[PDB]
């Protein structure tokens, strides 16, 4: 019900976030994760009220893939503040 519209807007508020950087790569990698939580919560919620137990595997597969996804994301982040001493995105403007 409405519970779902809050979670969905949470994902859109997290969407507006990842698409509007604020000079901190880490913060973004952190917003990105806010979505995965919202997706995980929504998937788990409907699976639970549909009594669809055959699908519970998914709520977790979503997290397992999302965790590594984030692992890759942070290694890129560490790589950046090793080459530029900061995670600030402006630095990432060489490919112009």
């Amino acid at each position: 019900p409405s519970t779902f519209f809050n979670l969905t807007m949470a994902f859109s508020l997290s969407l507006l976030g990842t698409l509007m950087f604020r000079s901190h790569l880490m913060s973004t990698l952190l917003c990105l994760e806010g979505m995965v939580l919202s997706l995980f919560i929504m998937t788990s919620v409907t699976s639970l009220n549909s009594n669809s137990m055959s699908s519970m595997p998914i709520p977790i597969t979503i997290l397992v893939f999302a965790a590594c996804e984030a692992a890759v994301g942070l290694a890129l982040l560490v790589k950046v503040s090793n080459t530029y001493g900061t995670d600030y995105v402006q630095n990432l403007n060489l490919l112009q």
Partner: peptide, 18 residues
Amino acid sequence: LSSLFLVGCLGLALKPSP
């Protein structure tokens, strides 16, 4: 609860200190 969650994601959206 949903509201609280939304609010929290709002903060993350504002992108405060990491």
